[PDB]
T-cell receptor
Framework: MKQEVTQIPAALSVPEGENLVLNCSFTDSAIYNLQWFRQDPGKGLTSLLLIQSSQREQTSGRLNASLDKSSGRSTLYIAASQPGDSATYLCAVTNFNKFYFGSGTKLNVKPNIQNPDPAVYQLRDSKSSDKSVCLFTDFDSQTNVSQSKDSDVYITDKCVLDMRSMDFKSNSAVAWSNKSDFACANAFNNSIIPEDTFFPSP | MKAGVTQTPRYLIKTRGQQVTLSCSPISGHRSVSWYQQTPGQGLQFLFEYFSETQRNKGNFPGRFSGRQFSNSRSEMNVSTLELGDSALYLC????????????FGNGTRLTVTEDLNKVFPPEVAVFEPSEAEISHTQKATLVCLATGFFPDHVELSWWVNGKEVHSGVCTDPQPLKEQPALNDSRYSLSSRLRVSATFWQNPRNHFRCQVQFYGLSENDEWTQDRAKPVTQIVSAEAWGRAD
């Protein structure tokens, strides 16, 4: 028979501290092992657990995975999620003479922003660039950043930085353009942003 | 520290019809070496596995994808008659025994196959200095680095403060944005942020640098365009702190 490995959900976004559940299934129960991996952007895979066909579970730290070979299922449980768990999680099985990977769960574990202070700032132009650059920062993790209505305005997705020695984390998104009818006041107009967002005078 | 799985080369740009050979060295003590192709469209697909110099298992790729293993367990793979759809991360994994021991992956060889080398451009890189309003409101200062107009997506962006690589206070986009999303050969843009205290930004002796390594054409690639040959290179931008 043809092996098919299915993983759900395709993507999971959750607040830090929550437990989470990742599902894997395989239609051909004649496997020798099941493995779980994580993969970070721009890197290879790291092995997290290997469950032999004769085993029902494996545990490592906050990770526990079950295997029900005859049902064709494995569940990966991640306790008390942390931002550094953010990665793509891959399920693989070893068949008699083939190996098969699922399509992955892309996990994003969001920081709890204790003191949100949403604001849109204009950065200084570069004497070596022709772009105008705007920074939406310090918003809570429930805020979603949308793409611009305009094809020559570029907006990145929210990115979390950690200022370790101040125990401070913050979200931001960058918007830029080199068109002239462009204002940081309006750069994020296609996003639902907090009504209390600070817009300093320019 | 001991070596992980190693792969050479790191990055390749090729034109259609060419061939490439890739090498992988397993972790010392590992004898099973496996190759996988990772693409956005098909995900992670098995090529073949070697043990003690012979192919033990194989996937479903056509014969223009080939492999081999030497007596010291080093393995090569070859792809002939390259096509646009062969652009991928080619991953090596070693294991003591793939039947019952974990796979350990390398970081891959990134291959981009393009119609024409005239599609290849290095990034332009700029640093944008912090907002005065951010500094007065938060007593923090965010620098932005933009790397724009590059193709292929074979870049590594890093921040350096007074000569030391920094990770605290940094966030770089996990993927680039396509400048023209409809096109297969679109150039890319990437953003990153570095946030420091206002006190640190206000010292004019502090020096900030955003570095982008771009992996481009070989010395053996022909180049007949007027613009500078888009060779492997670093493109950088810098700033110094400012009292006011």
């Amino acid at each position: 028979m043809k092996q098919e490995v299915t993983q759900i959900p395709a993507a999971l976004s959750v607040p830090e501290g929550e437990n989470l559940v990742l599902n894997c299934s395989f239609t051909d129960s004649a496997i020798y092992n099941l493995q779980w991996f994580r993969q970070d952007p721009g890197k290879g895979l790291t092995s997290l657990l290997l469950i032999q066909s004769s085993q029902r579970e494996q545990t490592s730290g906050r990770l526990n995975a079950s295997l029900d070979k005859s049902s064709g299922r494995s569940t990966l449980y991640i306790a008390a999620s942390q931002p550094g768990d953010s990665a793509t999680y891959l399920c693989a099985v070893t068949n008699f003479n083939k190996f098969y990977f699922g399509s992955g769960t892309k996990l994003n574990v969001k920081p709890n922003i204790q003191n949100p202070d949403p604001a849109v700032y204009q950065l200084r132009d570069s004497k070596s660039s022709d772009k105008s650059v705007c920074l939406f920062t310090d918003f809570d993790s429930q805020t979603n950043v949308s793409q611009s209505k305009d094809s020559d305005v570029y907006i990145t997705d929210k990115c979390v930085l950690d200022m370790r020695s101040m125990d401070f984390k913050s979200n931001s998104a960058v918007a830029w353009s080199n068109k002239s009818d462009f204002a940081c006041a309006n750069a994020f107009n296609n996003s639902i942003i907090p009504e209390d967002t600070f817009f300093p005078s320019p | 520290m001991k070596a992980g799985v190693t792969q050479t080369p790191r990055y390749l740009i090729k034109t259609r019809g060419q061939q490439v050979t890739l090498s992988c060295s397993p972790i010392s003590g590992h004898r099973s070496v496996s190759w996988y192709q990772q693409t956005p469209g098909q995900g992670l697909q098995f090529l073949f596995e070697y043990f003690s110099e012979t192919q033990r298992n194989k996937g479903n790729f056509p014969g223009r994808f080939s492999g081999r293993q030497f007596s010291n367990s080093r393995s090569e793979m070859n792809v002939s008659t390259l096509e646009l759809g062969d652009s991928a991360l080619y991953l090596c994994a070693s294991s003591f025994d793939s039947g019952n021991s974990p796979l350990h992956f390398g970081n891959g060889t990134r291959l981009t196959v393009t119609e024409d080398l005239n599609k290849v451009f290095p990034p332009e890189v700029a640093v944008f200095e912090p907002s005065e309003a951010e500094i007065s409101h938060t007593q923090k200062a965010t620098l932005v680095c933009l790397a724009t107009g590059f193709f292929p997506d074979h870049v590594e962006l890093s921040w350096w403060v007074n000569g030391k690589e920094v990770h605290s206070g940094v966030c770089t986009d996990p993927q680039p944005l396509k400048e023209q999303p409809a096109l297969n050969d679109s150039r890319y843009s990437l953003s990153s942020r570095l946030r420091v205290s206002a006190t640190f930004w206000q010292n004019p002796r502090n020096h900030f640098r955003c570095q982008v390594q771009f992996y481009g054409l070989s010395e053996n690639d022909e180049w007949t365009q007027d613009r500078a040959k888009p060779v492997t290179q670093i493109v950088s931008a810098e700033a110094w702190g400012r009292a006011d």
